[PDB]
Short mmCIF file of C-alpha atoms in Angstrom, two decimals:
data_model
loop_
_atom_site.label_atom_id
_atom_site.label_comp_id
_atom_site.label_asym_id
_atom_site.label_seq_id
_atom_site.Cartn_x
_atom_site.Cartn_y
_atom_site.Cartn_z
CA UNK A 1 -161.33 0.39 146.78
CA UNK A 2 -158.79 -2.61 145.54
CA UNK A 3 -157.18 -1.86 148.65
CA UNK A 4 -159.95 -1.19 150.70
CA UNK A 5 -161.88 -4.23 149.62
CA UNK A 6 -159.05 -6.42 151.17
CA UNK A 7 -158.60 -4.10 153.73
CA UNK A 8 -162.37 -4.48 154.52
CA UNK A 9 -161.81 -8.35 154.12
CA UNK A 10 -159.68 -8.46 156.77
CA UNK A 11 -160.37 -5.97 159.50
CA UNK A 12 -163.54 -8.70 159.55
CA UNK A 13 -161.45 -11.69 159.51
CA UNK A 14 -159.09 -10.14 162.18
CA UNK A 15 -162.24 -9.31 164.63
CA UNK A 16 -164.33 -12.58 163.93
CA UNK A 17 -161.34 -14.52 164.40
CA UNK A 18 -160.25 -12.67 167.55
CA UNK A 19 -163.50 -13.07 169.04
CA UNK A 20 -164.98 -16.49 167.71
CA UNK A 21 -161.35 -18.65 166.95
CA UNK A 22 -160.71 -20.22 163.46
CA UNK A 23 -162.98 -22.89 163.52
CA UNK A 24 -166.36 -21.30 164.02
CA UNK A 25 -165.66 -18.40 161.78
CA UNK A 26 -166.77 -19.27 157.80
CA UNK A 27 -165.58 -16.99 155.05
CA UNK A 28 -169.73 -16.26 154.68
CA UNK A 29 -169.65 -14.67 158.01
CA UNK A 30 -166.52 -12.84 157.24
CA UNK A 31 -168.21 -11.77 153.45
CA UNK A 32 -171.10 -10.40 155.25
CA UNK A 33 -168.97 -8.83 157.92
CA UNK A 34 -167.03 -7.26 155.76
CA UNK A 35 -169.99 -5.87 153.92
CA UNK A 36 -168.29 -7.25 150.41
CA UNK A 37 -169.14 -9.88 148.22
CA UNK A 38 -167.82 -13.62 148.34
CA UNK A 39 -166.72 -13.18 144.87
CA UNK A 40 -163.87 -11.18 146.41
CA UNK A 41 -163.08 -12.92 148.81
CA UNK A 42 -162.43 -15.68 146.55
CA UNK A 43 -160.31 -13.33 144.18
CA UNK A 44 -158.01 -11.71 146.97
CA UNK A 45 -157.55 -14.76 149.52
CA UNK A 46 -159.25 -17.78 147.86
CA UNK A 47 -159.71 -20.42 151.04
CA UNK A 48 -159.65 -19.89 155.32
CA UNK A 49 -156.23 -20.62 155.62
CA UNK A 50 -155.11 -18.07 152.82
CA UNK A 51 -157.08 -15.49 154.87
CA UNK A 52 -155.96 -16.41 158.47
CA UNK A 53 -152.34 -16.19 157.11
CA UNK A 54 -152.85 -12.72 155.56
CA UNK A 55 -154.62 -11.10 158.57
CA UNK A 56 -151.23 -12.79 160.56
CA UNK A 57 -148.81 -10.74 157.64
CA UNK A 58 -151.12 -7.36 158.26
CA UNK A 59 -149.35 -7.14 161.57
CA UNK A 60 -145.99 -9.45 161.07
CA UNK A 61 -144.77 -7.99 157.61
CA UNK A 62 -144.39 -4.09 158.62
CA UNK A 63 -143.05 -5.29 161.64
CA UNK A 64 -140.03 -8.23 160.69
CA UNK A 65 -139.09 -5.25 157.80
CA UNK A 66 -138.47 -2.98 160.78
CA UNK A 67 -137.42 -5.40 162.69
CA UNK A 68 -134.57 -6.63 159.99
CA UNK A 69 -133.61 -3.17 159.04
CA UNK A 70 -132.59 -1.78 163.07
CA UNK A 71 -130.88 -5.81 163.40
CA UNK A 72 -129.14 -4.80 159.96
CA UNK A 73 -128.47 -1.00 161.06
CA UNK A 74 -127.36 -2.29 164.82
CA UNK A 75 -124.53 -4.90 163.33
CA UNK A 76 -123.19 -2.52 161.01
CA UNK A 77 -121.64 0.27 164.16
CA UNK A 78 -118.39 0.72 163.56
CA UNK A 79 -117.91 -0.49 166.91
CA UNK A 80 -120.83 -2.80 167.44
CA UNK A 81 -120.69 -5.30 169.89
CA UNK A 82 -122.45 -8.36 170.62
CA UNK A 83 -126.58 -7.77 172.13
CA UNK A 84 -127.28 -8.44 175.47
CA UNK A 85 -130.55 -10.26 176.30
CA UNK A 86 -132.01 -6.77 177.61
CA UNK A 87 -130.66 -5.70 174.38
CA UNK A 88 -132.54 -8.45 172.03
CA UNK A 89 -135.52 -8.11 174.42
CA UNK A 90 -136.16 -4.29 174.46
CA UNK A 91 -135.55 -4.44 170.50
CA UNK A 92 -138.50 -6.74 170.01
CA UNK A 93 -140.37 -4.49 172.46
CA UNK A 94 -139.37 -0.98 170.87
CA UNK A 95 -140.33 -2.94 167.24
CA UNK A 96 -143.95 -3.60 168.91
CA UNK A 97 -144.30 -0.01 169.91
CA UNK A 98 -143.66 1.70 166.36
CA UNK A 99 -145.64 -0.27 164.58
CA UNK A 100 -148.14 2.29 163.16
CA UNK A 101 -151.69 1.48 165.07
CA UNK A 102 -154.91 0.44 162.79
CA UNK A 103 -157.80 -0.70 165.34
CA UNK A 104 -155.29 0.88 168.65
CA UNK A 105 -155.81 -2.47 170.32
CA UNK A 106 -153.28 -3.58 167.34
CA UNK A 107 -150.76 -5.42 170.05
CA UNK A 108 -153.75 -7.35 171.98
CA UNK A 109 -155.23 -8.97 168.72
CA UNK A 110 -152.07 -9.68 166.91
CA UNK A 111 -151.51 -12.10 169.91
CA UNK A 112 -154.95 -12.67 170.64
CA UNK A 113 -154.60 -14.50 167.23
CA UNK A 114 -151.40 -16.05 168.10
CA UNK A 115 -152.69 -17.56 171.16
CA UNK A 116 -155.54 -18.83 168.57
CA UNK A 117 -152.91 -20.63 166.70
CA UNK A 118 -151.60 -22.55 168.90
CA UNK A 119 -155.07 -23.32 170.79
CA UNK A 120 -156.63 -24.32 167.05
CA UNK A 121 -153.23 -26.18 165.85
CA UNK A 122 -153.30 -24.00 163.17
CA UNK A 123 -149.96 -26.06 161.75
CA UNK A 124 -150.30 -24.61 158.05
CA UNK A 125 -149.60 -20.78 159.79
CA UNK A 126 -146.39 -22.19 161.01
CA UNK A 127 -145.75 -23.56 157.55
CA UNK A 128 -146.39 -20.03 155.83
CA UNK A 129 -144.77 -17.87 158.86
CA UNK A 130 -141.08 -20.08 158.69
CA UNK A 131 -141.73 -19.96 154.61
CA UNK A 132 -141.96 -15.58 154.68
CA UNK A 133 -140.77 -14.23 158.52
CA UNK A 134 -138.27 -17.34 159.20
CA UNK A 135 -134.62 -15.88 157.74
CA UNK A 136 -135.72 -12.65 159.79
CA UNK A 137 -136.35 -14.95 163.32
CA UNK A 138 -133.82 -17.61 162.65
CA UNK A 139 -131.55 -14.38 163.09
CA UNK A 140 -132.97 -13.16 165.83
CA UNK A 141 -133.20 -16.25 167.64
CA UNK A 142 -129.29 -17.07 167.58
CA UNK A 143 -128.65 -13.88 168.93
CA UNK A 144 -130.90 -15.06 171.62
CA UNK A 145 -129.39 -17.88 171.88
CA UNK A 146 -125.96 -16.58 172.62
CA UNK A 147 -126.81 -14.00 174.71
CA UNK A 148 -128.10 -16.63 177.00
CA UNK A 149 -125.77 -19.71 179.24
CA UNK A 150 -125.63 -22.65 177.11
CA UNK A 151 -128.98 -24.23 177.91
CA UNK A 152 -130.07 -27.92 176.48
CA UNK A 153 -131.87 -26.70 172.95
CA UNK A 154 -135.20 -28.42 174.33
CA UNK A 155 -134.71 -26.30 177.26
CA UNK A 156 -134.26 -23.07 175.21
CA UNK A 157 -137.11 -23.67 173.36
CA UNK A 158 -139.35 -24.23 175.99
CA UNK A 159 -138.11 -21.10 177.82
CA UNK A 160 -138.68 -19.34 174.62
CA UNK A 161 -142.24 -20.21 174.53
CA UNK A 162 -142.61 -19.14 178.36
CA UNK A 163 -141.43 -15.84 177.26
CA UNK A 164 -143.87 -15.79 173.93
CA UNK A 165 -147.19 -17.02 176.40
CA UNK A 166 -146.03 -14.31 179.12
CA UNK A 167 -146.13 -11.31 176.22
CA UNK A 168 -149.62 -13.08 174.49
CA UNK A 169 -151.56 -13.68 178.01
CA UNK A 170 -150.65 -10.10 178.28
CA UNK A 171 -151.44 -8.63 175.99
CA UNK A 172 -154.71 -10.87 174.51
CA UNK A 173 -155.97 -9.66 178.33
CA UNK A 174 -154.81 -5.97 178.26
CA UNK A 175 -158.22 -4.52 178.85
CA UNK A 176 -158.89 -7.05 182.15
CA UNK A 177 -155.53 -7.21 183.29
CA UNK A 178 -155.29 -3.10 183.04
CA UNK A 179 -159.64 -2.83 184.56
CA UNK A 180 -157.69 -5.26 187.67
CA UNK A 181 -154.71 -2.94 188.40
CA UNK A 182 -157.14 0.15 188.23
CA UNK A 183 -159.50 -1.52 191.22
CA UNK A 184 -156.40 -3.22 193.17
CA UNK A 185 -154.05 -0.16 193.25
CA UNK A 186 -155.86 2.63 191.35
CA UNK A 187 -153.15 3.09 188.45
CA UNK A 188 -153.68 3.35 184.43
CA UNK A 189 -149.98 0.55 183.41
CA UNK A 190 -149.81 1.28 179.61
CA UNK A 191 -149.43 -1.24 177.30
CA UNK A 192 -145.53 0.01 176.66
CA UNK A 193 -145.02 -0.28 180.32
CA UNK A 194 -146.03 -3.54 180.98
CA UNK A 195 -143.48 -4.74 178.14
CA UNK A 196 -141.09 -3.18 179.71
CA UNK A 197 -141.60 -4.78 182.81
CA UNK A 198 -141.65 -8.29 181.38
CA UNK A 199 -137.73 -7.45 180.02
CA UNK A 200 -136.37 -7.87 183.32
CA UNK A 201 -138.72 -10.90 184.59
CA UNK A 202 -137.75 -12.38 181.05
CA UNK A 203 -133.94 -11.93 181.31
CA UNK A 204 -133.65 -13.09 184.55
CA UNK A 205 -135.56 -16.12 182.90
CA UNK A 206 -133.55 -16.95 180.54
CA UNK A 207 -130.98 -16.78 182.59
CA UNK A 208 -131.78 -18.71 185.13
CA UNK A 209 -129.59 -22.68 186.18
CA UNK A 210 -131.23 -25.41 183.86
CA UNK A 211 -133.87 -27.44 185.25
CA UNK A 212 -132.26 -30.71 182.92
CA UNK A 213 -130.45 -32.62 185.80
CA UNK B 1 -178.02 -39.23 188.01
CA UNK B 2 -178.38 -36.52 189.66
CA UNK B 3 -174.60 -36.13 190.12
CA UNK B 4 -174.53 -37.77 186.20
CA UNK B 5 -177.23 -34.86 185.30
CA UNK B 6 -174.48 -32.39 186.69
CA UNK B 7 -171.62 -33.80 184.91
CA UNK B 8 -173.40 -34.04 181.39
CA UNK B 9 -174.07 -30.35 182.05
CA UNK B 10 -170.21 -29.73 183.18
CA UNK B 11 -168.94 -31.44 180.86
CA UNK B 12 -170.81 -30.28 178.01
CA UNK B 13 -170.36 -26.22 178.88
CA UNK B 14 -166.45 -26.85 179.99
CA UNK B 15 -166.37 -28.51 176.79
CA UNK B 16 -168.00 -25.70 175.01
CA UNK B 17 -166.65 -22.97 176.64
CA UNK B 18 -163.10 -24.08 175.42
CA UNK B 19 -163.86 -24.11 172.34
CA UNK B 20 -166.33 -21.21 171.46
CA UNK B 21 -165.65 -18.81 174.35
CA UNK B 22 -168.44 -18.02 176.96
CA UNK B 23 -170.20 -15.41 174.98
CA UNK B 24 -170.93 -17.33 172.04
CA UNK B 25 -171.51 -20.48 173.79
CA UNK B 26 -175.74 -20.52 174.77
CA UNK B 27 -177.41 -22.22 177.19
CA UNK B 28 -179.66 -24.15 174.52
CA UNK B 29 -176.05 -25.64 172.96
CA UNK B 30 -174.84 -26.38 176.67
CA UNK B 31 -178.23 -28.88 176.89
CA UNK B 32 -178.23 -30.03 173.59
CA UNK B 33 -174.77 -30.91 173.70
CA UNK B 34 -175.16 -32.94 177.71
CA UNK B 35 -178.46 -34.23 176.26
CA UNK B 36 -180.68 -33.45 178.92
CA UNK B 37 -183.05 -30.45 178.80
CA UNK B 38 -182.95 -27.31 179.79
CA UNK B 39 -185.27 -27.44 182.90
CA UNK B 40 -182.19 -29.52 184.19
CA UNK B 41 -179.78 -26.61 183.76
CA UNK B 42 -182.51 -24.43 185.02
CA UNK B 43 -182.72 -25.74 188.28
CA UNK B 44 -178.64 -26.92 189.14
CA UNK B 45 -177.50 -23.25 187.71
CA UNK B 46 -179.93 -21.39 186.95
CA UNK B 47 -177.88 -18.85 185.07
CA UNK B 48 -174.92 -18.56 182.14
CA UNK B 49 -172.65 -16.94 184.72
CA UNK B 50 -172.97 -19.63 188.07
CA UNK B 51 -172.39 -22.44 185.25
CA UNK B 52 -169.23 -21.06 183.65
CA UNK B 53 -168.59 -20.39 188.26
CA UNK B 54 -169.28 -24.10 188.56
CA UNK B 55 -167.37 -25.21 186.01
CA UNK B 56 -164.42 -23.39 187.04
CA UNK B 57 -165.06 -24.78 190.71
CA UNK B 58 -164.85 -27.79 189.74
CA UNK B 59 -161.22 -27.75 188.90
CA UNK B 60 -160.13 -25.16 192.08
CA UNK B 61 -161.92 -27.16 194.38
CA UNK B 62 -160.22 -30.01 194.47
CA UNK B 63 -156.81 -27.63 193.98
CA UNK B 64 -157.67 -25.24 196.83
CA UNK B 65 -158.56 -28.18 199.10
CA UNK B 66 -155.65 -29.93 198.67
CA UNK B 67 -153.15 -26.96 198.44
CA UNK B 68 -154.97 -25.28 201.81
CA UNK B 69 -153.94 -29.25 203.78
CA UNK B 70 -150.78 -29.23 202.33
CA UNK B 71 -149.89 -25.84 203.37
CA UNK B 72 -151.24 -26.73 206.91
CA UNK B 73 -149.15 -29.42 207.02
CA UNK B 74 -145.91 -28.06 205.89
CA UNK B 75 -146.43 -25.12 208.37
CA UNK B 76 -147.14 -27.49 211.34
CA UNK B 77 -143.94 -28.80 210.96
CA UNK B 78 -141.89 -28.36 214.15
CA UNK B 79 -138.60 -27.20 212.45
CA UNK B 80 -140.83 -25.58 209.35
CA UNK B 81 -138.83 -22.39 207.97
CA UNK B 82 -140.34 -20.79 205.12
CA UNK B 83 -140.73 -21.52 201.57
CA UNK B 84 -138.29 -20.59 198.91
CA UNK B 85 -139.70 -19.66 195.75
CA UNK B 86 -139.20 -22.61 193.97
CA UNK B 87 -141.02 -25.17 196.53
CA UNK B 88 -143.93 -22.54 196.92
CA UNK B 89 -143.88 -22.78 192.88
CA UNK B 90 -143.43 -26.47 193.31
CA UNK B 91 -145.91 -26.97 195.68
CA UNK B 92 -148.27 -25.25 193.21
CA UNK B 93 -147.06 -27.72 190.39
CA UNK B 94 -147.62 -31.20 192.92
CA UNK B 95 -150.80 -29.85 193.50
CA UNK B 96 -151.66 -29.61 189.67
CA UNK B 97 -150.36 -32.88 189.16
CA UNK B 98 -152.53 -34.46 192.57
CA UNK B 99 -155.54 -33.27 190.64
CA UNK B 100 -157.64 -36.56 189.91
CA UNK B 101 -158.18 -36.64 185.94
CA UNK B 102 -161.35 -36.67 184.01
CA UNK B 103 -160.80 -35.27 180.32
CA UNK B 104 -157.07 -36.32 180.74
CA UNK B 105 -156.59 -32.96 179.16
CA UNK B 106 -157.73 -31.42 182.80
CA UNK B 107 -154.88 -29.05 183.23
CA UNK B 108 -154.87 -27.56 179.16
CA UNK B 109 -158.83 -26.79 179.70
CA UNK B 110 -158.55 -24.99 183.09
CA UNK B 111 -155.64 -23.25 181.59
CA UNK B 112 -157.76 -22.03 178.18
CA UNK B 113 -160.83 -21.09 180.36
CA UNK B 114 -158.86 -19.11 182.53
CA UNK B 115 -157.32 -17.28 179.74
CA UNK B 116 -161.19 -16.56 178.55
CA UNK B 117 -162.01 -15.13 181.44
CA UNK B 118 -159.56 -12.52 180.75
CA UNK B 119 -159.78 -12.07 177.57
CA UNK B 120 -163.89 -12.18 178.14
CA UNK B 121 -163.51 -9.99 181.09
CA UNK B 122 -165.48 -12.41 182.92
CA UNK B 123 -165.43 -10.08 185.97
CA UNK B 124 -168.55 -11.75 188.05
CA UNK B 125 -165.63 -14.97 188.07
CA UNK B 126 -162.90 -12.81 189.44
CA UNK B 127 -165.77 -11.97 192.04
CA UNK B 128 -167.52 -15.31 192.80
CA UNK B 129 -163.43 -16.58 192.61
CA UNK B 130 -162.62 -13.93 195.01
CA UNK B 131 -165.56 -15.22 197.35
CA UNK B 132 -164.92 -19.17 197.65
CA UNK B 133 -161.31 -19.47 196.95
CA UNK B 134 -159.74 -15.98 198.07
CA UNK B 135 -158.39 -16.50 201.92
CA UNK B 136 -156.52 -19.85 200.63
CA UNK B 137 -154.81 -17.73 197.34
CA UNK B 138 -154.00 -14.56 199.21
CA UNK B 139 -152.59 -16.53 202.27
CA UNK B 140 -149.93 -18.69 199.56
CA UNK B 141 -149.62 -15.26 197.65
CA UNK B 142 -148.51 -13.69 200.24
CA UNK B 143 -145.86 -16.35 201.32
CA UNK B 144 -145.10 -15.42 197.24
CA UNK B 145 -144.36 -11.47 198.29
CA UNK B 146 -142.09 -12.93 201.47
CA UNK B 147 -139.74 -14.98 199.59
CA UNK B 148 -139.00 -12.20 196.38
CA UNK B 149 -137.10 -9.71 197.04
CA UNK B 150 -139.17 -6.63 197.94
CA UNK B 151 -140.64 -4.57 194.97
CA UNK B 152 -143.04 -2.00 193.83
CA UNK B 153 -146.44 -3.95 194.63
CA UNK B 154 -147.91 -2.61 191.14
CA UNK B 155 -144.58 -4.73 189.79
CA UNK B 156 -144.97 -7.58 192.22
CA UNK B 157 -149.13 -7.99 190.47
CA UNK B 158 -147.42 -8.18 187.09
CA UNK B 159 -144.67 -10.26 187.50
CA UNK B 160 -147.25 -12.65 189.42
CA UNK B 161 -149.06 -12.37 186.18
CA UNK B 162 -146.50 -13.48 183.56
CA UNK B 163 -146.10 -16.59 185.56
CA UNK B 164 -149.34 -16.71 185.20
CA UNK B 165 -149.84 -16.02 181.69
CA UNK B 166 -146.39 -18.19 180.67
CA UNK B 167 -148.21 -21.41 181.99
CA UNK B 168 -151.58 -20.71 180.81
CA UNK B 169 -150.31 -20.09 177.36
CA UNK B 170 -147.86 -23.28 177.29
CA UNK B 171 -150.66 -25.71 179.04
CA UNK B 172 -153.55 -24.46 176.87
CA UNK B 173 -151.88 -24.79 173.61
CA UNK B 174 -149.68 -28.27 174.87
CA UNK B 175 -151.41 -29.98 172.08
CA UNK B 176 -149.66 -27.70 169.64
CA UNK B 177 -146.36 -27.34 171.69
CA UNK B 178 -145.58 -31.08 171.95
CA UNK B 179 -146.30 -31.70 168.32
CA UNK B 180 -143.65 -28.50 167.16
CA UNK B 181 -141.00 -30.15 170.12
CA UNK B 182 -141.29 -33.94 168.53
CA UNK B 183 -141.01 -31.80 165.09
CA UNK B 184 -138.38 -29.72 165.79
CA UNK B 185 -136.70 -32.24 168.25
CA UNK B 186 -137.73 -35.72 168.06
CA UNK B 187 -138.32 -35.58 171.86
CA UNK B 188 -141.85 -36.58 173.50
CA UNK B 189 -141.62 -33.30 177.00
CA UNK B 190 -144.72 -34.70 179.34
CA UNK B 191 -147.06 -31.48 180.76
CA UNK B 192 -145.18 -32.20 184.08
CA UNK B 193 -141.56 -32.16 182.33
CA UNK B 194 -143.04 -28.65 181.33
CA UNK B 195 -144.25 -27.90 184.44
CA UNK B 196 -140.88 -28.66 186.15
CA UNK B 197 -138.86 -26.58 183.36
CA UNK B 198 -141.12 -22.92 184.49
CA UNK B 199 -140.14 -23.24 188.18
CA UNK B 200 -136.12 -22.20 187.64
CA UNK B 201 -136.98 -19.42 184.85
CA UNK B 202 -140.17 -18.38 186.79
CA UNK B 203 -138.04 -18.00 190.38
CA UNK B 204 -135.53 -15.80 188.88
CA UNK B 205 -137.93 -13.50 187.26
CA UNK B 206 -139.43 -13.46 190.29
CA UNK B 207 -136.50 -12.03 191.75
CA UNK B 208 -135.02 -10.43 188.53
CA UNK B 209 -133.77 -6.39 189.90
CA UNK B 210 -137.09 -3.97 189.54
CA UNK B 211 -138.07 -2.49 185.94
CA UNK B 212 -139.11 0.93 187.93
CA UNK B 213 -136.71 3.06 188.00
#
């Protein structure tokens, strides 16, 4: 109820932001959609940026907690050897699958919002996500750096974003894409099946010869 | 002026759709932003779907005309041998670079709109784009099919969409991503440089071993 006031606000915000983007979604629209008063939004968040940050954290909090625990667990193994790109990419997939569903469209909505964070240049969010989750992500990225052939760092940056974009687009558009596949091929491909298909594609892309000559 | 009434409408629509998405953009908002009357929108387009279709065609029309001419030209060569994945992917990049700039952000806006076509399940547009550009695209895709190792067709479908998503995300978010690269690495990476970096990444991904076992 205190929990639920916050949940109703975050559910309203996450749906509206995913539908309309950040700029076009007001706090008063979120308030009316959440069925709470504006003071509740003021109390719990205090600004649109803080509410955007909290919507992200409701997804990334459990994910990163769980990813960190699993890295710790895998690196504590007595016979632990270095993760391969496929290991590391599968790890992220298994971790995303492990996140307790809320909307039942959780990965797609996260990825929709992630793309909007880029297209609406949400610098504040980049700073926040660094401040809160930067440790585990830096740790993960170093393992990816190590598992791939040596690349110019700037090229590594772009290839990581190619992976992220492929994932974000596929998941953001997963309803349309699964409808297309049903129409064109007569199959249902599941969201977890799609994520597993990304793995060989991404691993090979990461290992490709440099395009900086 | 008749040309320019249509251009003012399409400029307004393309910017608003890119900013707010299709559902939240009305024809009356487009009309007021374009500085024309509603009757002009009625005359030239007649519906929101037709206006969405025309916004796409203003990008794809010249692109596909030029892609078709270049395929015809390359396949007319007396000593013409089969295009490799890198050839074909570079071809699309060179063709995108050749499109005469309008906004100066043309590729990014096209790609923003393309992602919105998926996230807002614009079936009408899929049907229209087929009807108008399906010939040249089918032709191109067959060459890609042929240039890659044999894959389950459903896996080929997903890998093509991974390529498209990586491209669409990168270009849609190119302002944010170039700002990030400037901050993190002190470089300007140009949009054409980014597209060329996708090529080895995509070619290798397309060639990766199947993830269907």
